[PDB]
């Protein structure tokens, strides 16, 4: 079927990009290409990223408005509380697994290789309640410091979409529309139509996705000066990250799903393999959001009013893979600096990763800034982050799957809470 063809092409795009980038690097790489040729070579990946960033606003906002307006406020409140508990518990488990898998199997046992913590959470709270809806569509509040030599924190809005604030506003506005009654039907229909129109565009973009992924991966592995040396240096770190992701996705989340529902979790995952493949290929949660919702509603028995509400929220708040990656990177850096971590600092890492996972922006910087916040919370050198980013093109992808799987299973849990 053409859905299977698209999934196969999207997955094979990563392998083809890896091969193309290795060939280009072995044929001189960027120095042989030069800046002008390299920019054109990597441009298609940038085009794909721009296309994927375009859809996030209308898709998420309309989906959340519809999902919130399609449920009784009391039932919506109970469902949201349970979903938040599930997301927090899963993120905490991912962080704990990441820390445990790095203290053992030490990735940094070789010699080859800012905002205050309170101010970061105050900025998170400010972004949860945007001061302007139009501005929130492309800017987020951020605090810098001015010396008066007291470092007073002064804040301003800086580039970067405010997804968390818009999500909160969409949920509240949908609740208000539901409470209006027959007067709010027109707006519910309007936002549903907008959501369907946006999903059509997302489906069209999925066809160009493989070509963008090709050049994205090729350029991002051409930027590495030495593939062999870098991989020999970060082999154990990548092993820790991917092993933690595999353990969390294949053992922990399925175990929780079985314990609570007592149905087969792998039969559930078999119905969403296609969204998982799209997530791995594109590294975008919004890209798989429509396909994930379709598969969950059709292949699985999840009710529409459950999926349309839970999945858009999880795509923004549930970042198990990101938390695991951040904790593994923090332990790796702490081992590189030979700065022994005691129980207090381990708990600090866990709590900071869990708390900062909420509001992790969709941009690539959103998964590495939180790492800087964690390092500051524990007092680690940020200089080493250069290494961590160098393999994001792989690790981030592994994160994205774990960032969506936990969402789908989450819905699968709440369905049983409703049954």
In whole angstroms, the minimum distance from the beta carbon of 161 to Na ion comes to 16
* Long-range interactions of 190-199: CB distance < 8 A, separation 24+: 191/61, 191/62, 191/65, 191/66, 191/69, 192/62, 192/66, 194/58, 194/62, 195/58, 195/59, 195/62, 195/63, 195/66, 198/55, 198/58, 198/59, 198/62, 199/59, 199/290
Nearer to Na ion, 136 or 404 (CB): 404
Phi, psi angles (nearest 5°) of residue 143: -105, 125
Of positions 283, 348, 370, 403, contacts Na ion by CB under 5 A: 403
CA-wise closest residue to 352 among 329, 334, 375, 331: 375
- Alpha-carbon dihedral sign for residues 184, 54, 368, 318: positive
29 is in an annotated binding site: no
Among residues 284 and 335, whose Cβ is nearest to Na ion? 284
318 interacts with Na ion by CB under 5 A: yes
CB of 285 vs Na ion, minimal distance in Å = 5
Q: Which stretch binds Na ion (CB under 5 A): 50-58, 131-139, 364-372, 395-403?
A: 395-403
Size of the site for Na ion (CB under 5 A): 5
Q: CB of residue 282 vs Na ion: minimum separation in angstroms?
A: 14
Binding mask 140-179 for Na ion (x = CB under 5 A): ----------------------------------------
- Encoding tokens for residue 108? 């940094």
How far is Cα 310 from Cα 293, in angstroms, rounded to an integer?
A: 10
Query: Would you say 314 or 359 has its CB closer to Na ion?
Result: 314
Stretch that binds Na ion, among 129-137, 143-151, 355-363, 396-404 (CB under 5 A): 396-404
Residue 244 Cβ vs Na ion, minimum distance, rounded to whole Å: 16
Residue 90 touches Na ion, criterion: CB under 5 A: no
- Asked whether 10 and 210 are in contact (CB, 8 A), the reply is yes
Q: Please enumerate in sequence order all residues whose Cβ is within 8 A of that of 91, keeping only pairs 6 or more positions apart, or say none.
A: 318, 319, 320, 323, 353, 354, 357
Least spacing, CB of residue 332 vs Na ion, in Å: 23
Is 282 marked as a binding-site residue? no
> DSSP string covering 357-383, please?
HTT--SSGGGGTHHHHHHHHHHT--ST
At its nearest, how many Å lie between Na ion and the CB of residue 231? 28
The H or E element spanning position 384 is none
Nearer Cβ to Na ion, position 60 or 375?
Answer: 60
278 vs 318, beta carbon nearer Na ion: 318
Closer CB to Na ion, residue 296 or residue 315?
315
Q: Is 110 left (phi over 0), alpha (psi -120 to 50) or beta?
A: beta
x/- site string to Na ion, residues 287 to 316, per CB under 5 A? ---------------------------xx-
The reply to whether 316 sits in an annotated binding site is yes
Q: Shortest gap between Cβ of 400 and Na ion (angstroms)?
A: 9
Residue nearest Na ion by beta-carbon distance:
318
Among the listed ranges 64-72, 113-121, 268-276, 397-405, the one in contact with Na ion (CB under 5 A) is 397-405
What does 252-292 look like in DSSP terms, one character per residue? IHHHHHHHHH-S-HHHHHHTTHHHHHHHHHH--HHHHHHHH
Q: Give the range of 34-42, 84-92, 193-201, 403-411 binding Na ion by CB under 5 A.
A: 403-411
Q: How far is CA 228 from the centre of its chain?
A: 28
Q: Give min distance, CB of 185 to Na ion, in A.
A: 31
Q: Which is nearer to Na ion, 396 or 407 (CB)?
A: 407
User: Taking the complex as a whole, how short is the minimal distance between the CB of residue 291 and Na ion, in angstroms?
Assistant: 14
C-beta closer to Na ion: residue 318 or 354: 318
Closer residue to Na ion in complex, CB, 86/332: 86
Q: How far is CA 334 from the centre of its chain?
A: 24
Q: What DSSP character marks residue 9?
A: H
Token pair, residue 409, equals: 């299973």
Q: Is 416 annotated as a binding residue?
A: no
Outline where 27-72 has alpha helix (H).
29-69
User: Is residue 314 a known part of a binding site?
Assistant: yes
116 φ/ψ angles, rounded to the nearest 5 degrees: -70, 155
- Residues belonging to the binding site are 314, 316, 318, 403, 407
- Residues belonging to the binding site for Na(+) are 314, 316, 318, 403, 407
Q: Name the site residues for Na ion (rule: CB under 5 A).
A: 314-315, 318, 403, 407
């Amino acid at each position: 079927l053409r859905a299977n063809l698209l999934v196969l092409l999207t997955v094979v795009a990563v392998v083809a990009g890896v091969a193309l980038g290795l060939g280009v690097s072995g044929a001189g790489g960027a120095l042989a290409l030069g800046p002008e040729r390299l920019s054109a070579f990597v441009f298609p990946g940038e085009l794909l990223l721009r296309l994927l960033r375009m859809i996030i606003l209308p898709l998420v906002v309309c989906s959340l408005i519809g999902g919130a307006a399609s449920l009784d406020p009391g039932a919506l409140g109970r469902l949201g509380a349970w979903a938040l508990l599930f997301f927090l518990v899963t993120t905490l488990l991912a962080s704990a697994l990441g820390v445990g898998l790095a203290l053992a199997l030490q990735p940094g046992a070789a010699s080859a290789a800012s905002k205050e913590v309170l101010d970061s959470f105050l900025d998170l709270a400010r972004n949860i309640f945007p001061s302007n809806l139009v501005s929130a569509a492309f800017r987020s509040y951020s605090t810098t410091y001015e010396e008066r030599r007291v470092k007073v924190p002064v804040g301003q809005e800086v580039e970067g979409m405010n997804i968390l604030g818009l999500v909160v506003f969409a949920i509240v506005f949908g609740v208000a529309l539901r409470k209006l009654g027959p007067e709010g039907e027109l707006l519910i229909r309007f936002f549903n139509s907008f959501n369907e129109a946006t999903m059509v565009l997302v489906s069209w973009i999925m066809w160009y996705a493989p070509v963008g992924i090709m050049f994205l991966v090729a350029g991002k592995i051409v930027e590495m000066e030495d593939v062999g040396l870098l991989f020999a240096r970060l082999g154990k770190y990548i092993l820790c990250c991917l092993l933690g992701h595999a353990i969390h996705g294949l053992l922990v989340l399925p175990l929780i799903y079985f314990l609570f529902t007592r149905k087969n979790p792998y039969r559930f995952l078999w119905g969403i393999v296609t969204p998982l493949a799209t997530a791995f290929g594109t590294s975008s949660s919004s890209a798989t959001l429509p396909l994930m919702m379709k598969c969950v509603e059709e292949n699985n028995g999840v009710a529409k009013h459950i999926s349309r509400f839970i999945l858009p929220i999880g795509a923004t708040v549930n970042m198990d893979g990101a938390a695991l990656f951040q904790c593994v990177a923090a332990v790796f850096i702490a081992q590189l600096s030979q700065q022994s971590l005691d129980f207090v600092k381990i708990i600090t890492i866990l709590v900071t990763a869990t708390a900062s996972s909420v509001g992790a922006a969709g941009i690539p910087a959103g998964g590495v800034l939180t790492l800087a916040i964690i390092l500051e919370a524990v007092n680690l050198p940020v200089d080493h982050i250069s290494l961590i980013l160098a393999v994001d093109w792989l690790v981030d992808r592994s994160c994205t799957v774990l960032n969506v799987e936990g969402d789908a299973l989450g819905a699968g849990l709440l369905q049983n809470y409703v049954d």
